[PDB]
Design a protein around this nucleic acid. Sequence first.
RNA 1: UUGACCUCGGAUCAGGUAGGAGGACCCGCUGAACUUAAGCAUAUCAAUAAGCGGAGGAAAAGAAACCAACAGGGAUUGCCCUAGUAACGGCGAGUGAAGCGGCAACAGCUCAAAUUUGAAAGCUGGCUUCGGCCCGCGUUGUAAUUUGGAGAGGAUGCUUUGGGCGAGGCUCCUUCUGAGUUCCCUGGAACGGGACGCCACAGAGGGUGAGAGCCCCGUAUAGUUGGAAGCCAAGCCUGUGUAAAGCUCCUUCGACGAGUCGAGUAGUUUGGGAAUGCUGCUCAAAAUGGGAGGUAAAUUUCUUCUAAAGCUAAAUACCGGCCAGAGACCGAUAGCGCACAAGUAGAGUGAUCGAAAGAUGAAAAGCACUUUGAAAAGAGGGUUAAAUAGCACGUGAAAUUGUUGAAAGGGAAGCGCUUGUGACCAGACUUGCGCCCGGCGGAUCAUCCGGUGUUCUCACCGGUGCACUCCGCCGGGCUCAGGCCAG
RNA 2: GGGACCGAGGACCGCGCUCUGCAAGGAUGCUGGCGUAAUGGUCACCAGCGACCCGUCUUGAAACACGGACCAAGGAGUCAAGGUUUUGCGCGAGUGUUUGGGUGUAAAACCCGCACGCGUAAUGAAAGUGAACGUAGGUGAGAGCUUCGGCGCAUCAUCGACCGAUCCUGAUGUAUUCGGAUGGAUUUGAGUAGGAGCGUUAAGCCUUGGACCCGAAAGAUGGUGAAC
RNA 3: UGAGCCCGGGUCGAACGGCCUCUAGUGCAGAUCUUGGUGGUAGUAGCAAAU
RNA 4: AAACUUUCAACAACGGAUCUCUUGGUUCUGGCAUCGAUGAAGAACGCAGCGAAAUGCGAUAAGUAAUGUGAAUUGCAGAAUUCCGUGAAUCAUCGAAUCUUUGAACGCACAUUGCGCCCGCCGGUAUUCCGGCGGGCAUGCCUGUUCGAGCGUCAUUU
Lengths: 134, 117, 167, 260
Amino acid sequence: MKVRPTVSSSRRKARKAHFSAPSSVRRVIMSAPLSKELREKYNVRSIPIRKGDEVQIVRGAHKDKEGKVTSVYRLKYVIHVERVTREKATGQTVPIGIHPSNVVITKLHLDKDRENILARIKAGREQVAKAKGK
Amino acid sequence: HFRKHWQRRVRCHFDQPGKKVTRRLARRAKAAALAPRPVDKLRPIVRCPTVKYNRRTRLGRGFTLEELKAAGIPRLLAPTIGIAVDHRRKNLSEESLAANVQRLKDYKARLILFPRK
Amino acid sequence: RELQKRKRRSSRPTIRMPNRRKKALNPAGNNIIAKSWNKKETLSQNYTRFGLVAKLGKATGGTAPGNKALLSESDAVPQQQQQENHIRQHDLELESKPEVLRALEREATRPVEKTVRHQSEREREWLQRLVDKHGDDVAAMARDRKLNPYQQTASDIKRRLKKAGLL
Amino acid sequence: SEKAGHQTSAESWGTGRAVARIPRVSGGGTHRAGQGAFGNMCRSGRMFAPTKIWRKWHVKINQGQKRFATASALAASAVAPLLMARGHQVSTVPEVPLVVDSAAVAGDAVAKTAAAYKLLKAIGAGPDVEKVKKSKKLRAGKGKMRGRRHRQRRGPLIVYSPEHDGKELVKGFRNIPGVETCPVDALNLLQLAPGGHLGRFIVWTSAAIKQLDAVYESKKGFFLPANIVSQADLSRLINSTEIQSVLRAPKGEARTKRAC
RNA sequence: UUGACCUCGGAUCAGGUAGGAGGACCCGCUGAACUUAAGCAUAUCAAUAAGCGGAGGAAAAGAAACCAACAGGGAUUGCCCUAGUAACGGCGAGUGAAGCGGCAACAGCUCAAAUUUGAAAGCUGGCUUCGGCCCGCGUUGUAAUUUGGAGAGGAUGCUUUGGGCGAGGCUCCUUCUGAGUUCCCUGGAACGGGACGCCACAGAGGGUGAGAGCCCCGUAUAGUUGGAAGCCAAGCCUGUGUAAAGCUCCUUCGACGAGUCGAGUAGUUUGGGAAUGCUGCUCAAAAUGGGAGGUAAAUUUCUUCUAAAGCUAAAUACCGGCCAGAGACCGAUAGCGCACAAGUAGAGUGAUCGAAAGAUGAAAAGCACUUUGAAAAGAGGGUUAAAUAGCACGUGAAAUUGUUGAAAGGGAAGCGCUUGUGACCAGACUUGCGCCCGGCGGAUCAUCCGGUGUUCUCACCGGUGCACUCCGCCGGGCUCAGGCCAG
RNA sequence: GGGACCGAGGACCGCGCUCUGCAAGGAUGCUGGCGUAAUGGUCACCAGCGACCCGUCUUGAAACACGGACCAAGGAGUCAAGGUUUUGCGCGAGUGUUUGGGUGUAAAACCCGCACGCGUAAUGAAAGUGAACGUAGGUGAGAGCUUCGGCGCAUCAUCGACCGAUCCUGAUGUAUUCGGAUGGAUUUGAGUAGGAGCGUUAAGCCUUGGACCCGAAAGAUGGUGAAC
RNA sequence: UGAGCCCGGGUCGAACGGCCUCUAGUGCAGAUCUUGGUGGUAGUAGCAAAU
RNA sequence: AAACUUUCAACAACGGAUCUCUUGGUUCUGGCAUCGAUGAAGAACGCAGCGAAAUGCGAUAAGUAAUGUGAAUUGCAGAAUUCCGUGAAUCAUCGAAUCUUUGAACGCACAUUGCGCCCGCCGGUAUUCCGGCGGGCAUGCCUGUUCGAGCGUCAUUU
C-alpha cells in the first residue's frame, strides 16, 4: 500500500481536494480513455479531453451514442456532447450531462501540444517496457 | 502531593518513538557528515569517585596531558584525529595513567590516518 | 484559530512546504564510502559491511548478531612495559577483509606529492652575496654587520645555505 | 478540549427567581441569553469527567509472559484442528506446518507477486487467498467515516529467514491481499493469535525452522517451559490398565432408575 | 589679531537605528486572594493567577572561586534513579532538594592585565576611470602575540602551509511511466449476481447514475525531462614573503578583574543562620592572597578551585507561524462559540456578552400549457425509478389537531382476576412409510474390458451386456401409522 | 355404591401377589368430531368482585411539605498519582525489556549492555555487634503413608538452644589503663531457629486532585462608568 | 418469569447483523433539571409596549 | 337520537426524533523558522455588466508583468477574444510592478477630504492672479560633514 509520507489516505482530504481542485487539476481528473484503434496507433491509454474530440458513450442511459464534444463544464465535472440533449418543460433542448469516465475517445483534435503529450506518454511507456523486458 | 495544579503542569510521553527515530536520524546524519570517521570520539577509562562504586570503572571526559604525551600523540593534533582532551583531570596514579596509555596505544594501532589533501 | 479559518475562507492558494532537512541522511560524493553506502540499510549495518568501527563509546544496548560495528625492570614503572623528548606533531608515524576497508587502506598508503617549499629571490640574492664575501665561515657570516643586518645565528645561516644548495 | 463547555460567561440567578438554580448566561439581546451553561445536563455545557490525555493507554506485559504466549501460539499453529477453529480454510495442504523449500522461496524466484501466487496455489494456500478475496466486505459503523472502511479475513503468514531467504518475498507477498509476511527472528503474537484466537495458518520454510531452533535457544533469561502435565491425553490417563485395575467397583450407572 | 586643544550646542546635511505586533514555549520585575488545617491568624495555596518590560527558532545556562574525601571525578543541558532520603516545619496541616550511578548530546574559546617602540603595522567616511586618492577616529591606545592545569624570550633542530576557478554530486520542486468498460440477468443507471480473463516492488484513498486493483486521478520500485538555491567536491591555474606556525631545551621572566569580597543590619526567598540566594543602608579589605570544604586526633596541619569581564552549536520546552501525516475520538442539542452570513445577526454608554441555522434529486430534467383567482393559494396536465421526493424538498416518532367509522357516558377517570357481546385478523398433522405382483431403465451386478487419482487400497470415469443381485420409475394389490379435542 | 381433581415418568431391572399374568418402581383400550374454520389474538363495551398518585423527606408511626401540563433528545460514582485486600498469570531467592540503545513490513512487533527499584539476617538510643550444643532440639497431638511393625507435612501448647540490646557475673591477660571470657536475669526484638518475593491482570476499599451531578454570601487581581 | 428477541403487513431508500473477546462519553420519570416542540386555560382577559 | 366528552382504527395536519451521510471539530505525531518606518497587526473607503453575501484587489483596483500548462468562462448577458498559438483560463507557479484614507503614524490639526512652510512643474488674461500636481518637512540616539559659543585653556617679538 502507500509508503511515501507525502501521500495521504484520508478520505476527508481526498474529497476536499477533489471538490476544490483548480481547473488544470480538474482537466487531469477529467482525462478519458482512448478507443482500441487509437490505443494500438498511439501506445497511450488515456489523455485529457478537449472541445474537438469525437467521442462514443459506453455507460449510462444514452449508451452507444456518438458525437463530437460540445463543451467541458469543469465546474460540475461534466462534458456536453453533440446531439445528446433533453427537452425541458418549455421544450428547449439542454445537453444531457455525461462523464469523461463514462465516455471513450474515438477521434483526437490534434495540435502541437496534443502531439507532444502523446509523444511524452508513449516514450515513457516504451522506455519502461524495455527496462522491464531487458 | 496534589496541592498544586498538576492539571496545568502535567506533561506526557506520547512522542517517545518519534524522539527515538529522530535521535537515530541525527546520529545517521552525523555519520553521513563524518562518513569514514566514527560517530563518537575516543574517551578515557576513569574510576567512579564515591566509595560505593570504587571497584567499577566508566568513561571519562577526556584524556590527560601526561597520558597523551606518554602515548606519543600531540595535544593539538589529538582532537583532529578524534581524541577527547580534558585539561582539568590529573592522573594521580600510575595505574590509571598506564591504563589510559594502553587504551591510546590500542587506538593508534587500530587507527588509519589519511594524508591531508 | 481565526487565522486558520481565514485561510479556510480565503481563495488564496495553500503554500505547501517541501520536506527539507538541514542535514543529509546519506553520504554523497565520489569517495569509497559514498559509492559503497547502502541507503536502505542503517548506520550500524553499513559500518559492518565497510569494516569500520561506528561508535567508540560503550554499547548502550543489545546488538545485532555478529555486527562487530560497536566496540626485568629495576625501576618499577609499567610505562617501560607499555613502550614500544620531541614527537612529530603534525602527523602520526603509523607502522579476508572488506573491499571498502582495503580500498581505504590503499588510499591511505598511496604516496602523495611533496610540494617542497622554496625560497624567495631576495633571500637567494642575500645568501649569494654572503657566500661571495665570507666564503663558508659560519662564524664570520654571523659576525658581519653590513651584509647581515638581521643578526641571525650562524646555525640559522648554515641551514639556509644548505636549503639553498650552495655550501 | 480543556476549555470546552466553560468558555462562556454565566452566573446563577440564585433563589431570587422561580427557575432552576443553574448558572445562566448574562445578556438580554440574543437567543443564547438566559440559557443554562456549565452543566452536563445543559445543552452546550461541559461533559461529566472530560476525557484527558493522561489516561493509561499502553499496558506493560512481562517479557516472560509474552515469550510464553508466543510459544503457545506456535504450538497452536502446529496443532491442526486449531486452524479450522480460527477459521482458516485448511483442506488441500498436505502438511499442517507446511515447510516449503528455501531454494524456491529465496532470491528473486518469488519476488514477483505472480510467482508468489503460483507458489501459494501449488502449496495449498489458494483456498485461503480466495476466501479472503471473497470475504472482502464493507465495515458497519463509523469506522468508514474515521478511515476504516473495509474488513476482510486473514491469510496465511509466510515465515522466512532474512539471513538465507532474503527480503524479496516480503514485497511479493505484501502485494497479495490477506497474506502477511513476518521474519523468524521477530515473530509477532498479534499475527500468531489474531483476535486472541489460536491456530494461525503459517507457511514455514526450512531455514525458518532451523532458525526457530537457534533463536529459541538464544533468548537469554527464558527457557522452554516444562508443562505440569506430561501425557496430555486425559483419555489415556483415565482409560489405562493401571487405573482400571486399581479402581473399585462402580456404585451405579450413568442414568439411575427411579426408585419410588 | 591669528591658530590650536577641550567642552557644550544648532543644520529639512549624509548614512542608519527605536517604537508597534505576536507572546504556545523563554528571560526578568512585581505580586494576591479563595482553600486546607472540619473554627483561624504562622504556614499552605504560591515564589502561582492578574499587571509591567524584553528575544529567538528555540530561549536560558555553560566551560568551576565545582563535585567531593575518592583507587577520584571534571563546561552546561534533559530523562531514570537517588526520593518522599537528607533537611525544615502552629514538628499539625505539611514542605522538600542535592552528590553519586545508567543514559542522550558533547566543542571549546575571546579579553584587561606587557613596550610594535628598529617605525599605528589598525579602522570610519566620500571620490572614483573601481586601481587607489584623500578626510577623519585614534597614543587618555587601534593591529599582531598572550589568558594561570598557561605563556613570553632566546637557543635549538625537526615538521606544516596560502589563494582563484571548478566538471560533477547531494537536497527540493516538477514530465512521463500496469492491467476488462468481454458476454448474460437485475435495474433509471452496474460499481450488484454469474461466466470467462489480465496486472500487481501498484489490492492506500477518492471520483464516476449502487460494493470498481484492471473507466479516471492517483497508488509501488526503479528510472527519466527541465529548473532554484545552498553545501560538498574530482580536478586545473597562481603562489615568495629571509612570511607565518607547532614543538624541545633553559646560568632569563611570568602581569591574573574593588564600594568588589567581608562585618553589622532591614526586607524578600529557600529544604537550608556555616545567613539558602538576592536586594537596600553603615563601615569597608588582602597579596606566602582569596573561596569552598575535611578533621577530636592535638592544631586549625589536610583537600579542591580561582569570584567581582565576555562568547559559544547539541541533546531540552513549544495551546503560537508555514505545512504534512494519522486516531479503538464526536457525528449537527454531539464535536471548538462557529460544518452554513460566525466572533456574524443581535444587546449594552462602556469594558464586554453573543446565538439560531446541514441533507430535493443521478442529472433541474426546479412543473411547459389550460383553467380558477390578489395568494407564500388550487383543479387539470407534464418531468423523474419515485413528486404523499416540488427549493415548506434524504427517512419522517411522540406530544397536539382534524375528518370518517365503531362503541360508551345518571356527581371522576384510569388498573387487576374472570367471562360475554361486537369488530378486525390469523389459520390446526409440514399430513407417509412399508410390503406383494407385472413391465421398463440404471447400476459395489459381471470372478467383464479400458483409463485416471490415490490415504496403495480405496475411489471416480469411458465401454459392453441383464444370467444372478440391488436400486429406482410406471401400472396394479394389501397393510399400517399418525395432530388435537370429547364420550 | 355415587361424585369431584389429575395421568406426572417413558426399553428391562425392584418389591411382591390372588403367579398360563396381575390393580406389583405413575393411562391405557374403544368410538366419534375437527378446515367457508377447531382454536386463538388485539381493540371497544357491558357485567361480578378487588383496588388511595407517584418519587423525595421527616417521624415510632402517620399527617405535613417539596417536584410533576405533555412529548422527543441530553442528563449525573469518571480519570489519574499514591497506599491496601483478595482472584488469576509468569518467574522465583530472585524479580522488573520498553530511561535508553539495537532493530523493523516503522507510534506496532522483536532484542538487551550497564545501572536502578523491592526482596533474599537481625538488633541496639548509640559505639557497633551479629543468629546450630542436640536429625535446627525434645515431648504430645496432628493430614497422610505404612512391610501393620511403625514412619510422620503444615500448625499449635509446653519444656528447650542461639543472636542483637539492657542489668549483672568479671578469664588469660593489658601499653597499666584496656579488654570481655565464663555463668547468669520474673528481660526486651517489628529476632534466628532450613527464605516468599517482584512484575502483571481483574474486582473492592482509602487520600488528593473539579472528584457522583446541581446549587452561597464572600475575597483578590485588572479594567468600564458616573455621583449622593 | 423478566429486562428483551424473532417473524408477518405498510413505508423506505444504502448500508447492517449473530457469536468469542477488547473498550467506554453505555440503559432515565422525576433533579421548581437543559434545549426544542406542543396543549388546557381560550378564541377567554382585553384593543394596552411590541406586533 | 343529535351536540359535547372518552377509547381505538384508517387517512390527513403539526413537529423534527430515529437510521444514514459529512469540504467540520478534537487529540497525537513529523519537517522547517518567516511580521514591522523599504510602513506591521488592525480599521475605513472604493474597484464587477447584472453584486445581494463571501472572496480578491487598490484609481494599473475580482486586478497587471513573467514563467509553466495547453483550449476555456459559466447563473445570465459577451467578444469579429483565442486554437499548429508568445496562447484561452474565476488556471497553477510566482523572482517584476501598482499599492486610496487611517492605524507604532511621522508638517499642524483630525469630529474638516481643513490649515501650514521649502524646492520644481502644469493649465487658465499671466514676472505678479487663481487652481492643481510632483518632491519634501516627527522624535531620541550612533557615526561622519558643516556651522557656532565659551577669559575653560595653550601659545605666537626671530
